Write a protein that binds this ligand. Structure first.
Ligand SMILES: *[C@@H]1O[C@H](CO)[C@@H](O[C@@H]2O[C@H](CO)[C@@H](O)[C@H](O)[C@H]2NC(C)=O)[C@H](O)[C@H]1NC(C)=O
Ligand code: NAG
Ligand code: NAG
Ligand code: NAG
Ligand code: NAG
Ligand code: GLU
Ligand code: GLU
Lengths: 366, 89, 295, 402, 132
């Protein structure tokens, strides 16, 4: 037997001095209550069949009333792991790469110039034919437009033509910069989302489950009884067996302790499994070593564990054991949903046109 | 990256009369450009390039639908002619 | 070994940077496609349909003015079947122009810069009295890196007399000022200085290139008795990995001069030189046709 | 915060509408900074005070809060006579009988664990570094970045020279106004002018000229769409083990707060002796003084708790944190070894973790605040429009007179 | 660059915007239905065909917003094509001897050297790398 926890055990026996003999437990796993008795690494210590129970044991309130733990050395809580979805961008990026002041000031320049180029035409062309021209150069010359007939009125539009190129050329440059580097948009929040508390109120039934007979299930049962009854049909007997369900597309979310899911999310081929919240942890309770409730070894062990954290010996053990690859952006096609922002611009214009149509029609009657 | 740096060397038995002049010819050869010349002829002839970022140039085989679009429309209008004149006829 | 240091500020722009997108095929063989559609439209689509004159000369001018963005006055043809063909060709211009801009931005994100020198055998070092205002280089005297040059390249040793610093710290100052262009010294120090310089304004020629590989050592007295015991101790440190830790503790730098991604660039006349000379061919191309047009 | 003239603290309300809970704090007015001072009642409220009221109701006791006298956290200092070592600060009052509990952020250490008994941490955290953000954005004041002033000097010369030639070839083949307006039309892409190349010679030069205009615009866009991405003036410290930290350069000044737990951490290690002695002469007296120094550029780094530095970053919005956590030890309520409340306090913290109570204390007091081209970088492109109007008006008067 | 479902919507949106341009101008106090169609396509495809233009003020404002929707859709096209040419780069490679795949090997990964050489001696005198 070897691993991260065992290397801690060897140092404690070396720095304190005693003899041990590890043996695997066969009655259960991690401890559970069957209304009267305890089975697992907790029951053996409770029934004096052992002295300590080192491993991956979570500090709880129910357990700490019969056994006394030690100083935690690894943080642990509850997290949700889901398969990586397609790269999602903000649909509002059609008008985002600019400022409201730029477009607020955009029409204050035009309104002055259209009056100037018309007023100067009196000295040697309606206003409606002036806005139709100077504005048209902004979005490239593609619409029929009237033209002036003065040797100086042609000069003013040359200045406007120069400004038209700068605006259009710069706009297509900022858009590329935004679509080259960006950040993915998350899908679901933690355990307080609406898809978990009342899953039977939505058309798609979200599928989630957890390994029974642990601490991350006693937490859910005593806090969210509505969610617990729904998870009964979705249970898995092993962590690696449950991971294949996400790969096969059967499940949608897996609820387990954070210290294991993070390791599985890093040690992966292609790294297509991520944890919701970018490392979000609920009900933070670290690990610990169970003792005999009077073991008299509690104080020397606690002062030994706290000595390692003073140095960086525990940090080295994390780099050696708990480390992985591919701890980003995706080239995704635009699709309707991401481009739906600019389609709403035309919808308002169609509705606005009718109201202006009614204004002209009614006032002509009277 | 390199993680164990120790060069080569001509190996000789202990108590060998040639153990000094062999180690003095190598030092001189480094400073005369002789061993920077054997590297040129035997070790450093490039044969295949590398990947400096991802530079991509476009060729004809990259543009097939674009050019076949106009070539696929030059015959579409010919059929339109036989029905455009049919309106008058 | 021996290395050369430079300023990295001037660099070297890449001329003819506009013809890399596409190739010699999509450019040349587009003209024949231009000439086919224009000839077919005038003689078939327009001639044999009802509804002053639309010759070939105005047709080629129209189809040429859509690929390079609609900017020139043109005349549009009549008939329903003629406008459909023109409209489709306008959809080919949008794709052709849009992809050209997108591809060009790809080449100017991942561009590469070249050095102004190649080594210690470049003509700038060997023969400096035949160029523009001469190259400036020098080294600190009384050392191994000056004895090696004085024996092999005695022609350029005389020219190096005027430029002679008195310290590595002082020489790095004149590089940023402009009093000299190259500094020739040992490769175990110039690498450290370049890696511990803010702003990444100093780089080594050849990306860490040496020219006379001779390492360090301890100068024991001749015919001593401690030599064999010291050698076995040094060779022991390599096996245990106790030498890499010392390098990591002392000889670690922060500047990523290894990466060649130039932090943007500004286009100048020398950089944008091919475009003007493209018009240069057209300066006399029409003038040559001026004489032949009389006959 | 100070109390009112009447004596009671001000009634404030949260965003939702739940009134905050405050107590009466009796501490020194200025912690005697070179001058004597008495004790004046004040008002206390925050994360730990809100937690204290929860323990009182659960365990059924009564309390009274008073601040520390000197104002430090705690460390072991040697008496001048002999080597008698005694604690000082908030850690030295617990052992002297002047306090029965410590509800404040106390890092769980080993030196203090031999004299007092902590509890299960109520917040897990670590150490991190704080820097000041520099170069807020690219200037881009002039739009002529891609093309230096030499380019515009002759590009405007190119349109004139090609314009006069367009008048030459067509005229002398089997005017100036017609040629000039056509040349500028292609370059700026404006639908003006009617001049056309009727002659064959004028056509071949016009067709080539149309290619030149497209190239200039295309190069302009590509340069601007590539300069933005390749913009990285790297200045990050990258946490610990940075060369600028292990080997000081005599120009980088970094310090921390006196006493506390960072001093204990650096003194124990012998490989950090070369960097501890550097900041021993720059250590400040409070966290609030070190934060203000960063803004005023009198300090370059600050090593403190992650839970505090990550709350100032989202509020100041002018300084940012950078690095990686390198010392993981949570907080804890400190008590003497002979206190009988140790087990019940620790059992009342584990329950609050799993009840969701310590998520309300995080949303309310920690996570509520989160601080393109715009008007700047394009002011130059605006004045040309006004300059064109002003310059044009003067020529119109001459035009009228002509 | 665009999904096949989005392109068909752009083509369908041309007819819908163009069809009521004729209705809007005619009823209010003249462009034929076929003359309006050339106007919409000419704006989108940047072609210079046709001469029919709206006459009513209410008809102008619709054929005027449409000329802004034509520029956005083209501009977004060339910005995404600049993302399928520069963003095709994954990241997965072995980084030295400290890579996790070497310190704790799996059955799927196999690495070896030459028997009876210097590398064998290097991997014996170090006790930390006794697992590979
Ligand atoms: C800590 O909690 C325990 C259990 O709640 C307390 O022990 C109980 O105290 C009450 C007080 O009268 C007794 O009636 C019970 O018999 C005790 N035991 C149990 C199992 O309830 C204990 O007093 C608390 N600690 C302190 C310091 O008050
Ligand atoms: C959980 O405990 C019950 C108790 O009877 C047992 O039947 C079941 O198999 C256990 N599930 C596990 C260990 O996954
Ligand atoms: C090495 O050179 C020296 C002097 O050149 C000479 O005396 C000696 O014999 C040489 N060594 C051998 C092995 O010949
Ligand atoms: C080098 O040697 C010369 C001649 O001995 C001496 O004058 C000079 O001070 C020495 N040092 C330097 C840096 O030139
Ligand atoms: C809580 O304290 C009150 C105040 O004296 C007292 O009645 C008793 O100690 C406790 N009350 C309970 C447990 O109901
Ligand atoms: N490993 C944790 C959690 C187990 C589980 O989630 O079932 C424990 O020992 O309690
Ligand atoms: N590395 C050189 C420094 C002196 C020089 O380069 O001139 C030496 O030790 O000899």
């Amino acid at each position: 037997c070897k691993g991260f926890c065992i290397d801690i055990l060897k140092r404690l026996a070396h720095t304190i001095g005693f003899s041990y003999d590890l043996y695997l437990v066969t009655n259960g796993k991690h401890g559970k209550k069957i209304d009267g008795v305890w089975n697992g690494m907790i029951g053996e210590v409770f029934y004096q069949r052992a002295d300590m129970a080192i491993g991956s044991l979570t500090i709880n309130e129910e357990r700490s009333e019969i056994v006394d733990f030690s100083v935690p050395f690894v943080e642990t809580g509850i997290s949700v792991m889901v398969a990586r979805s397609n790269g999602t961008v903000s649909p509002s990026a059609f008008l985002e790469p600019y400022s409201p002041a730029v477009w607020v000031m955009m029409f204050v320049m035009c309104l002055t110039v259209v009056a100037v180029t018309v007023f100067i035409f009196e000295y040697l062309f309606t206003i409606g034919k002036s806005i139709w021209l100077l504005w048209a150069l902004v979005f490239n010359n593609s619409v029929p437009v009237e033209n002036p007939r003065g040797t100086t009125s042609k000069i003013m539009v040359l200045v406007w033509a120069f400004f038209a190129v700068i605006f259009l050329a710069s706009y297509t440059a900022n858009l590329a910069a935004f679509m080259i580097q960006e950040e993915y948009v998350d899908t679901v929040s933690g355990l307080s989302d609406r898809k978990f508390q009342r899953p039977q109120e939505q058309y798609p039934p979200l599928k989630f489950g957890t390994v029974p007979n642990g601490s991350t299930e006693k937490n859910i049962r005593s806090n969210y009884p509505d969610m617990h009854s729904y998870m009964v049909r979705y249970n898995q007997p092993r962590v690696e067996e449950a991971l294949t369900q996400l790969k096969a597309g059967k499940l949608d979310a897996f609820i387990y302790d954070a210290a294991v899911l993070n390791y599985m999310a890093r040690k992966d081929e292609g790294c297509k499994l991520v944890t919701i919240g970018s490392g979000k942890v609920f009900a933070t309770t670290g690990y610990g070593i169970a003792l005999h409730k009077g073991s008299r070894w509690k104080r020397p062990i606690d002062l030994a564990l706290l000595q390692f954290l003073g140095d960086d010996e525990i940090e080295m053990l994390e780099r050696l054991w708990l480390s992985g690859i591919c701890h980003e952006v995706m080239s995704s096609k635009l699709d309707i949903d991401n481009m739906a922002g600019v389609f709403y611009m035309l919808l308002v214009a169609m509705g606005l046109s009718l109201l202006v149509f009614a204004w002209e029609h009614l006032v002509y009657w009277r | 990256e390199l993680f164990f740096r120790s060069g080569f060397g001509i190996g000789m038995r202990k108590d060998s009369p040639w153990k000094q002049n062999v180690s003095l010819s190598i030092l001189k050869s480094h400073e005369n450009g002789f061993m920077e010349d054997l590297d040129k002829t035997w070790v450093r002839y490039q044969e295949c390039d590398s990947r400096s970022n991802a530079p991509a140039t476009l060729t004809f085989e990259n543009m097939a639908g674009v050019f076949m679009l106009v070539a696929g429309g030059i015959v579409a209008g010919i059929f339109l002619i036989f029905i455009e004149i049919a309106y008058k006829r | 070994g021996i290395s050369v240091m430079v300023s990295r500020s001037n660099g070297t722009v890449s001329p003819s940077a506009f013809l890399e997108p596409f190739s010699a095929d999509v450019w040349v063989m587009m003209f024949v496609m231009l000439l086919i559609v224009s000839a077919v439209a005038v003689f078939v689509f327009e001639y044999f349909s009802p509804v002053p004159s639309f010759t070939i000369g105005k047709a080629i001018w129209l189809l040429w003015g859509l690929v390079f963005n609609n900017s020139v006055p043109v005349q549009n043809p009549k008939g329903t079947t003629s406008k459909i063909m023109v409209s489709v060709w306008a959809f080919f211009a949008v794709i052709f122009l849009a992809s050209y801009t997108a591809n060009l931005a790809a080449f100017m994100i991942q561009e590469e810069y070249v050095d102004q020198v190649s080594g210690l055998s470049d003509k700038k070092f060997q023969r400096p009295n035949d160029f523009s205002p001469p190259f400036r280089f020098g080294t600190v005297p009384n050392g191994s890196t000056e004895r090696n040059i004085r024996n092999n390249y005695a022609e350029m040793h005389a020219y190096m007399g005027k430029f002679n610093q008195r310290g590595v710290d002082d020489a790095l100052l004149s590089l940023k000022t402009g009093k000299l262009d190259a500094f020739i010294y040992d490769a175990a120090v110039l690498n450290y200085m370049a890696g511990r310089d803010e702003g990444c304004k100093l780089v080594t020629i050849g990306s860490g290139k040496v020219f006379a590989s001779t390492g360090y050592g301890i100068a024991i007295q001749k015919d001593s008795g401690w030599k064999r015991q010291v050698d076995l101790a040094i060779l022991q440190l390599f096996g245990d990995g106790e030498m890499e830790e010392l390098e990591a503790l002392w000889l670690t730098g922060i500047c990523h001069n290894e990466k060649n991604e130039v932090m943007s660039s500004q286009l100048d006349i020398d950089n944008m030189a091919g475009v003007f000379y493209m018009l240069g061919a057209a300066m006399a191309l029409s003038l040559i046709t001026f004489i032949s047009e009389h006959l | 915060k100070p109390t009112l003239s009447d004596g009671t603290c001000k009634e404030e309300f949260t965003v939702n509408g739940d009134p905050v809970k405050k107590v009466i704090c009796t501490g020194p007015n200025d912690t005697s900074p070179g001058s004597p001072r008495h004790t004046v009642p004040q008002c206390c409220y925050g994360f730990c005070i809100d937690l204290l009221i929860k323990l009182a109701r659960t365990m059924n006791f009564t309390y009274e809060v008073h601040l520390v006298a000197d104002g430090k956290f705690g460390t072991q200092e040697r008496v001048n006579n002999s080597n008698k070592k005694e604690w000082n600060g908030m850690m030295g009052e617990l052992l002297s009988g002047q306090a029965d509990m410590i509800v404040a952020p106390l890092t769980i250490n080993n030196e203090r664990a031999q004299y007092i008994e902590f509890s299960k941490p109520f917040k897990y955290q670590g150490l991190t570094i704080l820097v000041k953000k520099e170069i807020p954005r690219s200037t881009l004041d002039s739009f002529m970045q891609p093309f230096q002033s030499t380019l515009w000097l002759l590009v405007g010369l190119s349109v004139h020279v090609v314009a006069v030639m367009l008048y030459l070839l067509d005229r002398f083949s089997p005017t100036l106004s017609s040629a000039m307006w056509f040349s500028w039309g292609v370059l700026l892409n404006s639908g003006i002018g009617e001049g056309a190349p009727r002659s064959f010679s004028a056509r071949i030069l016009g067709m080539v000229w149309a290619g030149f205009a497209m190239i200039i615009v295309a190069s302009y866009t590509a340069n601007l769409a590539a300069f933005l991405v390749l913009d990285r003036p790297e200045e990050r410290i990258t946490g610990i083990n940075d060369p600028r930290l292990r080997n000081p350069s005599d120009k980088f000044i970094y310090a921390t707060v006196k006493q506390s737990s960072v001093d204990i951490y650096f003194r124990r290690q012998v490989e950090l002796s070369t960097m501890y002695r550097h900041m021993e002469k720059h250590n400040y007296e409070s966290a609030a003084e070190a934060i203000q120094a960063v803004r005023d550029n009198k300090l370059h780094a600050f090593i403190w708790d992650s839970a505090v530095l990550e709350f100032e970053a989202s509020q100041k919005c002018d300084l940012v944190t950078t690095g990686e956590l390198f010392f993981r030890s949570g907080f804890g309520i400190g008590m003497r070894k002979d206190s009988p409340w140790k087990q019940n306090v620790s059992l009342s913290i584990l329950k609050s973790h799993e009840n969701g109570f310590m998520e309300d204390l995080d949303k309310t007091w920690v996570r509520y605040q989160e601080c393109t081209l715009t008007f700047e970088n394009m002011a130059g492109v605006f004045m040309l429009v006004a300059g064109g109007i002003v310059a044009g008006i003067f020529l119109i008067f001459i035009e009228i007179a002509y | 660059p665009f999904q096949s479902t989005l392109w068909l919507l752009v083509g369908l949106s041309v007819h819908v915007v163009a069809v009521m341009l004729y209705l809007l101008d005619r009823f209010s106090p003249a462009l034929t239905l076929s003359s309006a169609m050339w106007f919409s396509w000419g704006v989108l495809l940047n072609s210079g065909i046709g001469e029919g233009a709206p006459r009513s003020f209410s008809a102008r404002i619709l054929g005027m917003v449409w000329a802004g929707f034509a520029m956005i859709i083209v501009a977004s096209y060339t910005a995404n094509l600049a993302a399928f040419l520069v963003l095709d780069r994954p990241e997965e490679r072995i980084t030295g001897i400290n890579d996790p795949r070497l310190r704790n090997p799996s059955d799927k990964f196999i690495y070896a050297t030459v028997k009876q050489s210097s590398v064998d001696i290097y991997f014996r005198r170090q006790v930390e790398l006794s697992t590979m």
